[PDB]
């Protein structure tokens, strides 16, 4: 939240904020930060390593999330899909084998939410 506040010069939380989870604006590029924690010893630090980030489920509301199938995950998270189904896109050169998914890191720009028309996040009107 501190880094999104700094890059995107503004932070607005959900109108009905929840202390457990802060909410991120679809306009702002979402760059998450993870840290590895040792439970045996107190030492906890940021995760300076690469990872593969994917969206594997979605819900119009909480308690409505549904895991997607492998083909759906491919069509949503991978740039190779021709159908306008991508949920997000990031500008990073690293990619996995067969170029299917990006390989992100803490130094990457971030995740840009775009919600093409086939993606489940499309055609959403406030209830």
């Amino acid at each position: 939240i501190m880094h999104s506040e700094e890059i995107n010069k503004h932070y607005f939380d959900c109108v009905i904020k929840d202390a457990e989870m802060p909410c991120f604006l679809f306009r702002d590029l979402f760059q998450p930060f993870f840290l590895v924690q040792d439970l045996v010893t107190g030492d906890s630090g940021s995760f300076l390593g690469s990872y593969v980030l994917k969206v594997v489920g979605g819900g119009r509301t909480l308690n409505t999330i549904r895991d997607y199938t492998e083909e759906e995950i491919f069509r949503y998270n991978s740039p190779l899909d021709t159908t306008n189904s991508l949920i997000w896109k990031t500008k990073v050169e690293r990619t996995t084998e067969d170029k299917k998914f990006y390989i992100m890191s803490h130094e990457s720009p971030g995740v840009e939410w775009l919600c093409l028309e086939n993606s489940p996040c499309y055609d959403i009107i406030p209830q």
Partner: protein, 258 residues
């Protein structure tokens, strides 16, 4: 062509069509001044796009109907000409939006914002509303005398721009690689000279040049300042004072006329 256009007229200049459109324009400007806080624009983003498509449709209505009514006489008046240009910008950014993906990389694209400010230009129509209700004409007199002064204001303004432009050309020719941060490009030469013309930190560029390059810029800058700030801007002041003096003599003779 004589009955259809004529009824389009007599519905167009109607004393309800104008009020309907001014209600629309005052609503659009209250939205447009709502959108400049970031605490309301970010919340109420989804309703604002709906409302602005609505306003685009309304402006299609008005512009097409007025053109069909009044031929090229519509193009004749400049108040409308402003509206037509605003219309063109609105339709262009509409189609550009549809031909792109409405995402973050387009929010932060400069051309999207540039096309958005021209929407701000719709607020100008609001003055027309303020004119009918009245501005009280409290600044009718000042505006009238500014109106009288402008013909010579334009002339002296373009003369001093010309002086700016010549000095900018020669300064680019001479003082490259002596502080390239300031005027490595012709455009930044011209801007540096223009911002000198307001006398803000103008000694700083002399010192900056003298540090690494050389000081020949001091006679050029002194002569520049002499010509522009000392003999040109004072001309603007002088001509404005004389114009308002004529306004005052007119008022004195007019009040003695009664």
């Amino acid at each position: 062509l004589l009955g259809l256009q004529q009824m389009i007229l007599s519905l167009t200049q109607s004393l309800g069509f104008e009020t309907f459109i001014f209600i629309v324009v005052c609503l659009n400007t209250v939205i447009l001044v709502a959108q400049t806080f970031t605490e309301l624009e970010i919340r109420g983003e989804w309703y604002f796009m709906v409302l602005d498509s609505i306003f685009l449709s309304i402006y299609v209505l008005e512009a097409v109907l007025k053109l069909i009514a009044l031929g090229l006489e519509y193009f004749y008046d400049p108040w409308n000409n402003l509206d037509f240009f605003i219309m063109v910008m609105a339709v262009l950014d509409f189609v550009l939006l549809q031909i792109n993906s409405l995402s973050y990389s387009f929010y932060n694209h400069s051309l999207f914002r540039i096309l958005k400010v021209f929407k701000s230009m719709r607020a100008l129509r609001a003055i027309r509303v303020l004119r009918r209700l009245s501005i009280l004409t409290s600044l009718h007199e000042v505006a009238g005398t500014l109106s009288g002064s402008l013909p010579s204001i334009t002339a002296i303004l373009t003369l001093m721009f010309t002086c700016l432009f010549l000095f900018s050309v020669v300064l680019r020719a001479l003082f490259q690689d002596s502080d390239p941060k300031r005027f490595q490009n012709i455009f930044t030469t011209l801007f540096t000279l223009f911002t000198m013309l307001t006398l803000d930190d103008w000694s700083l560029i002399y010192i900056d040049n003298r540090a690494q390059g050389a000081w020949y810029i001091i006679p050029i800058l002194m002569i520049y300042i002499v010509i522009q700030y000392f003999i040109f801007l004072n001309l603007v002041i002088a001509v404005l004072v004389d114009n308002f003096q004529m306004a005052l003599l007119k008022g004195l003779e007019k009040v003695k006329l009664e």
